[PDB]
Structure formats: structure tokens, C-alpha cells
Amino acid sequence: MQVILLDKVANLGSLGDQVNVKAGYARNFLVPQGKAVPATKKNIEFFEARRAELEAKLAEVLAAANARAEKINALETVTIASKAGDEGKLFGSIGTRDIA
Amino acid sequence: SRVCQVTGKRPVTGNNRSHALNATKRRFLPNLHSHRFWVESEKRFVTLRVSAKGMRVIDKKGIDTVLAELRARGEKY
RNA sequence: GCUUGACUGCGAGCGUGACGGCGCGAGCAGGUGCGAAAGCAGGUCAUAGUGAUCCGGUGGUUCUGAAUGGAAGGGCCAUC
RNA sequence: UGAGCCUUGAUGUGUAGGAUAGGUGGGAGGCUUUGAAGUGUGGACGCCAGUCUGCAUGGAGCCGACCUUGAAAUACCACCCUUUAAUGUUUGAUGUUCUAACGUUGACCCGUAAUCCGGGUUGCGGACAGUGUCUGGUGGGUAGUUUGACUGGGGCGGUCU
RNA sequence: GUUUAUUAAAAACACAGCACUGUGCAAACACGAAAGUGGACGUAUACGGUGUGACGCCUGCCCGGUGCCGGAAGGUUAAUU
RNA sequence: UUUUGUAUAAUGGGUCAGCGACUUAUAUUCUGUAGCAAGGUUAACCGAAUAGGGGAGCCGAAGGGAAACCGAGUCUUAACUGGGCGUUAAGUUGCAGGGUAUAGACCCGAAACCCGGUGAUCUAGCCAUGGGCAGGUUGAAGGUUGGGUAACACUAACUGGAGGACCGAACCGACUAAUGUUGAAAAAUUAGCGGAUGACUUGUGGCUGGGGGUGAAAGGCCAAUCAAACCGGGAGAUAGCU
RNA sequence: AGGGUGACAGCCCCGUACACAAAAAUGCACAUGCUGUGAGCUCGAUGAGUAGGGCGGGACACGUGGUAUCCUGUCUGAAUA
RNA sequence: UAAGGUGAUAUGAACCGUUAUAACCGGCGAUUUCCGAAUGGGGAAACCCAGUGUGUUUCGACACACUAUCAUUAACUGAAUCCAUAGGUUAAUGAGGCGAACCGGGGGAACUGAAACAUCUAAGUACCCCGAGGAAAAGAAAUCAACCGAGAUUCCCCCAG
Ligand SMILES: [Mg+2]
Ligand SMILES: [Mg+2]
Ligand SMILES: [Mg+2]
Ligand SMILES: [Mg+2]
Ligand SMILES: [Mg+2]
Ligand SMILES: [Mg+2]
Ligand SMILES: [Mg+2]
Ligand SMILES: [Mg+2]
Ligand SMILES: [Mg+2]
Ligand SMILES: [Mg+2]
Ligand SMILES: [Mg+2]
Ligand SMILES: [Mg+2]
Ligand SMILES: [Mg+2]
Ligand SMILES: [Mg+2]
Ligand SMILES: [Mg+2]
Ligand SMILES: [Mg+2]
Ligand SMILES: [Mg+2]
Ligand SMILES: [Mg+2]
Ligand SMILES: [Mg+2]
Ligand SMILES: [Mg+2]
Ligand SMILES: [Mg+2]
Ligand SMILES: [Mg+2]
Ligand SMILES: [Mg+2]
Ligand SMILES: [Mg+2]
Ligand SMILES: [Mg+2]
Ligand SMILES: [Mg+2]
Ligand SMILES: [Mg+2]
Ligand SMILES: [Mg+2]
Ligand SMILES: [Mg+2]
Ligand SMILES: [Mg+2]
Ligand SMILES: [Mg+2]
Ligand SMILES: [Mg+2]
Ligand SMILES: [Mg+2]
Ligand SMILES: [Mg+2]
Ligand SMILES: [Mg+2]
Ligand SMILES: [Mg+2]
Ligand SMILES: [Mg+2]
Ligand SMILES: [Mg+2]
Ligand SMILES: [Mg+2]
Ligand SMILES: [Mg+2]
Numbered sequence: 012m013q014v015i016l017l018d019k020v021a022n023l024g025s026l027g028d029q030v031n032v033k034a035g036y037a038r039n040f041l042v043p044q045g046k047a048v049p050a051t052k053k054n055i056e057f058f059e060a061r062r063a064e065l066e067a068k069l070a071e072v073l074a075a076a077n078a079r080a081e082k083i084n085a086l087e088t089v090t091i092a093s094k095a096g097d098e099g100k101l102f103g104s105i106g107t108r109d110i111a
Numbered sequence: 112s113r114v115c116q117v118t119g120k121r122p123v124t125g126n127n128r129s130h131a132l133n134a135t136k137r138r139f140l141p142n143l144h145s146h147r148f149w150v151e152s153e154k155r156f157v158t159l160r161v162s163a164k165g166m167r168v169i170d171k172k173g174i175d176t177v178l179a180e181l182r183a184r185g186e187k188y
Numbered sequence: 189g190c191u192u193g194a195c196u197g198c199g200a201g202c203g204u205g206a207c208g209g210c211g212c213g214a215g216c217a218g219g220u221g222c223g224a225a226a227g228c229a230g231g232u233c234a235u236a237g238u239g240a241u242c243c244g245g246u247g248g249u250u251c252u253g254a255a256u257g258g259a260a261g262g263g264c265c266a267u268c
Numbered sequence: 269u270g271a272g273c274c275u276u277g278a279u280g281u282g283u284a285g286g287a288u289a290g291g292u293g294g295g296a297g298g299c300u301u302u303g304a305a306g307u308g309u310g311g312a313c314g315c316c317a318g319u320c321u322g323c324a325u326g327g328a329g330c331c332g333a334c335c336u337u338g339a340a341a342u343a344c345c346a347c348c349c350u351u352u353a354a355u356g357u358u359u360g361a362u363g364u365u366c367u368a369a370c371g372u373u374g375a376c377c378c379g380u381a382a383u384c385c386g387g388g389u390u391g392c393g394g395a396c397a398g399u400g401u402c403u404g405g406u407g408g409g410u411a412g413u414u415u416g417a418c419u420g421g422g423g424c425g426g427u428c429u
Numbered sequence: 430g431u432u433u434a435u436u437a438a439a440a441a442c443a444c445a446g447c448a449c450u451g452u453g454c455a456a457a458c459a460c461g462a463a464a465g466u467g468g469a470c471g472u473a474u475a476c477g478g479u480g481u482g483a484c485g486c487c488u489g490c491c492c493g494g495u496g497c498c499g500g501a502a503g504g505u506u507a508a509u510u
Numbered sequence: 511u512u513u514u515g516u517a518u519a520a521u522g523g524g525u526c527a528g529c530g531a532c533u534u535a536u537a538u539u540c541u542g543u544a545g546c547a548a549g550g551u552u553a554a555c556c557g558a559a560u561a562g563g564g565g566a567g568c569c570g571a572a573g574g575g576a577a578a579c580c581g582a583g584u585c586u587u588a589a590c591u592g593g594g595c596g597u598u599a600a601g602u603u604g605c606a607g608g609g610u611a612u613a614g615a616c617c618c619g620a621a622a623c624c625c626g627g628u629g630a631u632c633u634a635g636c637c638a639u640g641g642g643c644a645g646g647u648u649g650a651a652g653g654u655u656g657g658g659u660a661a662c663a664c665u666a667a668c669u670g671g672a673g674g675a676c677c678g679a680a681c682c683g684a685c686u687a688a689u690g691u692u693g694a695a696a697a698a699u700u701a702g703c704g705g706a707u708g709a710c711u712u713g714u715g716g717c718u719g720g721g722g723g724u725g726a727a728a729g730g731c732c733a734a735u736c737a738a739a740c741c742g743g744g745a746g747a748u749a750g751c752u
Numbered sequence: 753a754g755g756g757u758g759a760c761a762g763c764c765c766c767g768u769a770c771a772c773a774a775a776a777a778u779g780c781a782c783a784u785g786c787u788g789u790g791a792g793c794u795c796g797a798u799g800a801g802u803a804g805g806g807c808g809g810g811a812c813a814c815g816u817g818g819u820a821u822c823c824u825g826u827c828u829g830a831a832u833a
Numbered sequence: 834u835a836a837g838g839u840g841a842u843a844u845g846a847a848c849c850g851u852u853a854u855a856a857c858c859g860g861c862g863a864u865u866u867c868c869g870a871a872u873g874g875g876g877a878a879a880c881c882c883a884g885u886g887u888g889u890u891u892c893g894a895c896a897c898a899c900u901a902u903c904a905u906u907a908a909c910u911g912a913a914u915c916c917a918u919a920g921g922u923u924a925a926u927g928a929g930g931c932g933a934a935c936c937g938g939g940g941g942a943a944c945u946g947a948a949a950c951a952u953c954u955a956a957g958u959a960c961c962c963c964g965a966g967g968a969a970a971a972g973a974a975a976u977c978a979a980c981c982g983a984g985a986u987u988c989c990c991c992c993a994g
Contacts, residue, residue, distance in 0.1 A: 012170060034170055035395090039369040043149035043156075049170070113400095113463085118801095122462090123825060124940070125809040132815080132952050133412090136941080138462080139809070139825035142400035146369075155918075158386095163400080163827085164801075171801055185904090 117165030
């Protein structure tokens with residue numbers, strides 16, 4: 012019985028390693044004690060959907076995380092009016108409440 | 112009765128044939144076993160009287176589909 | 189002494205049996221042996237020494253070969 | 269305790285010799301600071317010559333065309349015949365342990381104002397037991413049948429071509 | 430005591446007693462395709478089967494044959510492969 | 511009727527009347543008869559329904575050979591002087607009949623085998639619940655008292671009331687004889703006989719079902735039936751016999 | 753046709769041939785009304801513990817035979833125009 | 834439809850009717866005890882005993898109706914045990930039993946024949962059982978054929994003893 016392991020079984024595999032297990036081992040232990048589920052070539056894509064979909068929603072964010080750091084060195088100059096007077100003391104007005 | 116709930120295998124009749132070809136009526140009974148099947152879709156064990164072949168049918172088809180066939184066929188499990 | 193006629197295919201005509209069958213058989217073809225030759229030899233002086241069929245086994249035979257080519261199986265001859 | 273197997277590591281004295289030459293292609297140097305050579309030494313092989321390999325110290329050295337030879341280097345490579353080492357893994361056997369199938373004619377709980385049953389919880393057995401299919405044995409327990417003819421009656425005896 | 434109702438009442442059957450054997454309980458055993466039931470709501474001082482047949486004195490030799498028990502070395506030996 | 515043979519004292523029949531046994535179907539062959547004739551004939555079916563259609567087919571006109579194959583020839587054999595079967599002989603379809611085949615197959619007739627049911631109102635055993643045993647005898651253990659014992663033991667008397675105990679009616683049975691034997695009765699009667707508080711007997715109800723039951727065991731009993739009940743069915747079993 | 757009628761009836765009677773009949777219920781047919789089911793065209797898809805196999809049996813006229821084919825109790829087990 | 838009728842053994846009595854509610858015939862209704870699937874529970878069939886709810890110008894009691902089982906469905910309820918499930922109550926729908934043969938399916942003899950008998954036969958017959966229908970079943974090629982082609986199934990005649 013070809014099963015996909017939902018967890019680490021000691022002498023078999025690791026969170027997905029399709030192995031050929033005796034049917035009694037799977038029928039009576041690995042499936043009811045949820046260490047595995049049979050390899051129907053739908054569960055090789057349905058709970059290896061955790062291998063497929065949860066991996067497939069990472070390649071476009073890997074590409075979308077490149078167009079976010081593209082608008083970085085664009086503006087780089089702001090009208091800053093709080094002068095560093097006699098050696099730089101903060102008293103002015105630049106950030107986080109209200110300009111009208 | 113000695114009937115598999117999955118496949119419907121029943122006792123069937125035949126002959127014992129000796130070397131002299133004496134025919135005496137016999138029976139061929141199914142390899143029936145009461146077995147507790149885990150239903151992950153119900154968080155529950157279901158007990159079926161099932162042939163060893165029916166167990167292979169359950170492994171190949173899945174218990175969720177086999178129980179659907181039963182409740183279509185009546186067969187209060 | 190020399191030899192394989194204890195030959196192969198046949199067989200006029202007979203004898204004997206309810207039948208199955210069993211027996212005797214000149215002569216014909218082919219090919220042998222012995223004899224100088226005439227000739228003789230198809231087992232043994234004769235009469236007992238035996239067992240139907242079925243089922244199969246062996247060998248031979250392109251006779252048959254379930255679409256066709258083969259094969260299997262069957263048949264035929266020999267034999268167990 | 270038995271065999272398989274990708275892959276790599278290791279098994280190879282006609283004599284010519286510096287001596288443990290299966291072979292063809294690929295070639296002019298590979299290996300050595302993720303560690304050399306000269307020594308001691310663990311367990312094996314052994315034609316008793318020395319090879320393979322583990323480990324420790326060691327810190328800049330082992331190995332070629334060679335002189336010879338039908339074949340010239342484990343100098344790096346590649347494929348592969350003879351040879352035996354090793355696991356992942358493959359299926360074999362006995363025993364031990366485990367539990368999760370299975371069993372429970374143990375206990376408690378519920379259905380339930382029920383010594384049935386079922387479910388639950390738990391314990392105890394536990395891959396046995398038991399059951400199906402196949403299979404050898406045994407099997408007048410049961411069943412179906414056979415158990416001859418002649419014959420101064422039949423049987424005994426004798427006979428049967 | 431029991432028995433051949435309807436030709437046999439007996440020396441036959443049974444009997445208490447005796448012995449052998451099986452049986453550790455979901456007992457053996459029996460009725461049952463089975464479930465289960467009896468055994469027994471009993472547990473080896475119990476139950477089943479067998480034979481003998483109060484009591485008394487006793488019960489001798491034979492394990493080759495057949496059976497049963499135990500052994501498991503080897504020989505042969507099924508399905509399977 | 512059966513037999514070598516029967517007046518036979520061998521079978522059968524009391525008599526009369528009525529009923530009672532070689533059939534039917536389909537195939538096959540022979541005979542007769544009719545039709546057509548090297549041809550004969552259709553079956554189902556259609557239908558204009560005993561017509562007509564329908565020639566699917568069947569038999570026949572050629573055989574030989576295991577067969578391929580050949581063909582008035584063929585097979586055998588390497589091949590026949592030859593030998594075997596064939597060639598020189600009209601069949602076919604109806605109708606009627608004689609036989610054969612398959613069917614119950616001329617009629618009657620078994621014991622029996624199998625299937626499915628009905629039966630424990632008889633009987634056998636068990637289960638539950640109730641009842642019955644006149645009357646008379648015997649006198650176990652134990653108890654009490656007295657004796658006796660260091661104490662137990664032991665002992666005498668009185669008591670006590672055991673027992674598959676004794677005698678004997680009911681009750682249950684059935685040893686003998688006679689009667690009866692087409693009975694009064696398909697097992698009784700009469701005179702005697704055994705048990706009669708038990709392993710007794712009896713009432714009512716209940717359970718066990720046929721290769722099964724039950725059986726203190728006789729193959730006994732399971733509804734006057736028992737070495738496999740009864741009823742119905744397979745079934746007209748089969749019957750080389752009468 | 754047939755049946756009766758005091759013996760045998762075409763013409764005595766009931767009938768028969770023939771021709772007529774339905775308030776109501778109901779059937780088999782045609783048309784139609786309502787509520788159901790979806791025709792026609794396009795690309796696709798094409799029945800797995802199954803076929804097949806081993807063991808045992810059964811069914812096919814076919815008795816395991818050299819025995820195809822079907823069914824399957826048991827153990828297995830493909831391919832996918 | 835009618836001048837005659839009140840079924841028969843079977844008269845008589847007492848009546849009905851005669852031009853259209855006499856009787857007779859037919860359609861549609863209505864009544865339709867008790868038993869019996871029997872269905873409220875039980876039961877030695879035609880009997881016994883209830884429960885609930887409605888109503889009843891005497892409050893002694895009456896009348897009617899409903900109340901089986903299983904299945905399916907739904908709603909409400911509701912364990913061990915959190916959800917949950919099992920379970921339970923109600924309601925709705927349907928089934929239940931009978932019946933000659935034919936039909937399909939599940940099981941399945943023996944006598945007999947073989948001049949015995951076991952393979953074989955009888956025969957998938959008889960019989961038991963389930964289920965259905967007016968017919969059932971079968972049925973639209975994973976069929977035959979033989980290189981030509983046919984074109985689901987069923988039945989009849991041949992093929993052919
Ligand atoms: Mg002589
Ligand atoms: Mg061929
Ligand atoms: Mg072929
Ligand atoms: Mg041959
Ligand atoms: Mg016997
Ligand atoms: Mg004799
Ligand atoms: Mg006595
Ligand atoms: Mg007697
Ligand atoms: Mg007597
Ligand atoms: Mg004795
Ligand atoms: Mg002795
Ligand atoms: Mg032994
Ligand atoms: Mg005489
Ligand atoms: Mg005379
Ligand atoms: Mg006289
Ligand atoms: Mg006489
Ligand atoms: Mg006389
Ligand atoms: Mg007489
Ligand atoms: Mg007469
Ligand atoms: Mg017989
Ligand atoms: Mg019987
Ligand atoms: Mg019966
Ligand atoms: Mg008695
Ligand atoms: Mg007494
Ligand atoms: Mg009297
Ligand atoms: Mg008397
Ligand atoms: Mg007395
Ligand atoms: Mg006797
Ligand atoms: Mg009797
Ligand atoms: Mg009998
Ligand atoms: Mg009958
Ligand atoms: Mg008869
Ligand atoms: Mg196939
Ligand atoms: Mg097979
Ligand atoms: Mg076959
Ligand atoms: Mg009732
Ligand atoms: Mg009632
Ligand atoms: Mg016979
Ligand atoms: Mg047979
Ligand atoms: Mg074509």
C-alpha cells in the first residue's frame with residue numbers, strides 16, 4: 012500500500028516520502044493514528060497540496076517582493092525645516108501628528 | 112448471514128470431487144472477517160463483516176466511497 | 189559347413205467356427221540365403237505355449253490440421 | 269542466522285623484472301595544508317614475498333618513458349571478465365519485545381427500571397488464537413455399494429482358458 | 430428395583446462399590462452449518478466416557494500383534510515455490 | 511394355468527351382472543397399395559385456411575478410400591498375374607399394415623430408495639405443578655437415667671421411631687394355571703401371584719421428531735404400525751419373476 | 753344455428769339472420785389541454801480489485817481431455833485506441 | 834324492462850303491483866357484524882382485556898374515532914462523552930396476506946437405466962425457498978463468420994441424431 016506520510020515515522024520517512032508499506036501497517040496503525048494517508052495520485056496532490064499549493068504561493072511573492080524595493084532611491088530629497096542649530100538639538104516639527 | 116457487506120460474496124455451492132470422481136455436495140464460504148474501519152470523514156470506527164477481497168476493495172476505493180455504496184444499497188451498517 | 193526365408197507386399201482356392209475369429213495354402217511381384225544344379229526356404233515333425241475392445245505410450249508417415257500459415261490433437265503403418 | 273542488489277571500495281606472481289603485468293580507448297605527470305614520506309600497530313588476505321586497510325604521531329614527499337618486456341604502469345579517467353568485502357534495501361528462518369488488527373464466556377459506564385446485544389472506558393491475551401480457501405493425514409462416526417458361476421439341493425471342497 | 434405394551438421377568442439390564450481414562454473451565458463431552466444451549470449458575474473430594482458389579486480373600490505372566498501415550502534424530506512425504 | 515407330464519389330492523375361480531389388459535406419439539425398416547418418376551416430396555410459415563403459395567431442406571440418381579484425394583472406378587502395394595469394395599439393378603412421397611427404437615409402452619403386483627410435511631392426546635425419557643398410599647408389625651441411630659471409666663470407651667433398662675425394612679387392602683404391576691382363541695375383549699376373564707414411603711405411583715400441562723428421538727438396553731417404545739413412524743409426493747420406481 | 757312445446761315443427765313458443773339501443777361507469781385506440789422528463793448541433797469522455805492468472809469447483813452437447821469460451825469460492829492482478 | 838311479483842326444497846299465510854318507485858335486469862353509490870394479513874394488547878380462529886382523545890337537555894354510564902410491525906423520509910427530542918453519534922417520541926408515504934399455471938433466481942434428491950456398481954444416467958427433473966409480471970426472461974455484439982460477408986434478443990422448421 013503506497014502511503015504518503017503526514018508526519019515523521021521513525022524507520023520509514025519524513026513528512027512526505029511515498030513508501031511501500033504493508034497494508035496492515037497502514038490500515039490499522041498509520042491511517043487511524045494519523046501518520047499517513049494512502050497515495051491515490053490525488054492525495055499525492057491533495058495533501059501534497061501542502062507540497063504543491065503552499066509552495067506555489069511563494070514563487071510569485073518572491074517576484075512581487077522585487078518590485079517593492081524598486082521605488083527606494085527615487086525621491087531621496089525632502090524639504091526638511093528643523094535646523095540642526097548649535098550642535099543638533101530636536102525642538103522642531105517634522106513627524107507623525109498634524110500639518111494643515 | 113455469511114455475506115460480505117462490501118462485495119456481496121455469499122456462500123456458493125459446489126462439489127467435492129474424489130479421485131474416483133465421486134461428487135458430494137459442498138459449500139464454498141467467503142473469507143469473512145469482522146473488521147473495524149477508520150472513517151476519517153466521521154472521526155469514527157465503522158465495523159463491517161467483510162471479505163478479505165472487500166478489504167482490498169476498501170484499500171483501493173476508500174471507505175468513504177464504499178460506505179456510500181452500502182447506504183445506497185440499504186445495508187444498514 | 190555356409191547362412192537369416194523366424195523376408196516385405198499380396199494371394200487362386202480351401203478347411204474350421206453362430207460370430208469375433210483361427211487354420212492350410214500353390215502361385216505373383218520385390219529383394220535374399222543355401223546348392224554345381226534340379227530345387228528348397230514366408231520359422232521350428234505337427235497338434236498347447238494364450239487375452240477381444242477401450243484408454244493411452246513409443247517410433248514412422250506434411251493423411252487431416254476448426255480464419256490463414258504452422259502446431260497441438262486426431263487418423264494411417266509399425267509396435268508396447 | 270540465509271540469499272539478492274544500483275553504486276562505489278577492494279580480488280589478478282608462465283618467465284623477461286627495481287616486483288602481486290586481465291584488457292581497449294583516453295594521455296603526458298595525478299595525489300599531498302577538508303593533509304605527504306620515513307615508523308609503531310588493530311583486524312584480514314597470503315604463493316610468506318608483501319599487498320589491502322583502520323588508527324595515532326608525523327609535516328613538505330610517494331609515484332612514468334625507465335635498462336628490460338608478446339602487454340608498460342593504480343600517473344588522473346572510462347567500460348568490464350575472474351575474485352570476494354558493505355550497507356540502504358530486497359525477500360528466508362527461529363526467538364525476544366512491542367501494539368494497532370483480531371480475541372476476551374474479566375471489570376466498570378451508557379443505551380436501559382435488561383446476566384441478550386451494541387457502543388464506550390479499562391485491563392488481560394495478542395499477530396498467536398480463531399475463521400475462509402487450498403492441502404497431506406486420520407476417519408464404519410456416517411453414507412453408497414460389492415461380495416461370481418458350475419454344482420445329482422445349497423455350502424464346504426474342487427473346477428473355470 | 431428394571432425389561433421384550435401384545436408368546437421370553439430371567440442367570441439379562443440397572444445398582445451401590447471398584448478401576449482405567451479423559452477433562453484447568455470459553456473444561457472435556459454432547460445438540461447445533463451457526464448463534465448459542467446443556468455440562469453447570471457446577472470447577473478435579475468436580476464432570477464426561479469406558480469396563481467391572483454388594484461384601485470377603487484376591488486379581489498372576491505376556492507390550493511381539495492392534496490401539497493409545499510419549500519421543501523426535503534421521504528416512505519417506507502434500508499444497509506451495 | 512403351469513408343465514416332460516395333471517381327474518389329479520398342483521394353481522385359480524362361490525355365482526351373476528357390469529368394468530378389466532399389445533395402446534398412443536414420434537422416428538426407423540420391410541410388405542402391400544396409390545400417386546409421380548431420374549426424379550420424388552415439401553417443413554415451419556403465409557393464406558386467397560383441407561386449396562394455393564413456400565423446395566429451406568430431406569431421400570434418390572456413384573462409388574472407393576482412415577483421409578487427402580481419385581472417380582465407373584477406387585483402395586491396397588514400389589507395382590499387381592492380382593485381390594477387396596463398387597460399377598451391368600428406380601427411386602420417392604402418401605395411405606394401410608408387420609417389426610424395431612424412445613417414451614409407463616400389454617395389464618396388474620413388490621419389498622424398498624429419495625424429497626417435503628404431520629404426529630409424544632398411546633408409549634419412552636425428562637421438566638413444572640398438584641394428588642395418592644386402609645390397617646397392622648419390626649424397633650436402627652440418637653436421647654435420658656442408673657451403673658462403670660482418671661476420663662473416653664463399654665454396659666442394662668426406659669425412651670426414640672430409622673428403613674429402596676416386614677405382613678397386608680387401595681394403588682401400581684403381571685409369575686402360574688385354566689377359560690377364551692369367528693373372544694364379552696385385535697391381549698381380556700377367573701382363581702391364585704409380586705411390589706405396596708419408594709429407584710414408588712398418579713392427575714393436569716409442557717419438551718424431545720424419523721437415521722431422528724427416547725431407551726435401568728428388550729432393537730424396546732415413538733397413536734392397535736418400528737432393524738428406521740405416518741401422510742402426501744418423485745411414482746405408472748424397478749420386477750430377466752408369478 | 754339451436755332449444756322447447758302431450759310422438760319428429762322453417763311457418764305454436766323462445767330464438768336465429770338482419771337491423772336498432774345507453775342515463776351511468778369503464779377499457780383499447782386517435783386528436784388535443786395541463787403538469788413532468790429534455791430533442792438537434794460542437795469539442796470531449798468511453799465502466800479496475802476489473803480483464804487475465806494460480807488453486808478449487810460449477811456451466812458450456814463437450815465427463816480435464818491436447819480443451820478454447822463463460823461463472824466465481826480462494827489468493828492475486830494488467831493494459832487504458 | 835314490465836303485467837305480473839314477494840330466491841329454492843315448498844306449499845300456504847299475509848301482502849305488493851297491473852301504464853309506472855310491484856318484482857325482474859344493468860351502471861353508479863350506500864350499508865357492509867365477528868374471525869382471518871388481522872394491524873390497540875392478548876388468545877384454545879370467529880373470544881378475552883385495554884389505553885388515549887373527542888362528544889353526549891338524567892351523570893348509572895353510552896356513542897364514534899384512533900392506537901400493530903417493518904422500511905423510507907422528515908421534524909422534535911436525546912446517552913455513555915465536548916461536539917457528536919447511537920437511542921427515543923411524533924407525523925407522512927409505502928409494504929404486509931392470498932392466489933391455478935406460466936416466468937426468473939437461490940438451493941437440490943433418489944428410485945431408475947447402465948441388464949451388478951462407484952464415473953456416468955435419471956436431472957438441474959421432483960421437491961423446498963425468494964421474487965416478479967401480464968407475461969416474465971433475454972436483448973442492441975468486447976457476436977458470428979472466414980478474407981466473401983452477416984448485423985440485438987426471443988420463438989417455430991431445418992441443419993442433425
Ligand atoms: Mg514339437
Ligand atoms: Mg489453422
Ligand atoms: Mg483457430
Ligand atoms: Mg499422430
Ligand atoms: Mg456400511
Ligand atoms: Mg449357484
Ligand atoms: Mg425383585
Ligand atoms: Mg411379552
Ligand atoms: Mg410373561
Ligand atoms: Mg457384567
Ligand atoms: Mg489382570
Ligand atoms: Mg507416535
Ligand atoms: Mg414338475
Ligand atoms: Mg389323465
Ligand atoms: Mg377331490
Ligand atoms: Mg399347494
Ligand atoms: Mg385341482
Ligand atoms: Mg380357490
Ligand atoms: Mg362377467
Ligand atoms: Mg442405487
Ligand atoms: Mg427422507
Ligand atoms: Mg423435511
Ligand atoms: Mg415406564
Ligand atoms: Mg418395603
Ligand atoms: Mg375385571
Ligand atoms: Mg388377578
Ligand atoms: Mg406387601
Ligand atoms: Mg437381539
Ligand atoms: Mg404401537
Ligand atoms: Mg424402510
Ligand atoms: Mg408434492
Ligand atoms: Mg408398479
Ligand atoms: Mg475473457
Ligand atoms: Mg479455474
Ligand atoms: Mg475447458
Ligand atoms: Mg395480534
Ligand atoms: Mg386486535
Ligand atoms: Mg442398475
Ligand atoms: Mg452423475
Ligand atoms: Mg468487413
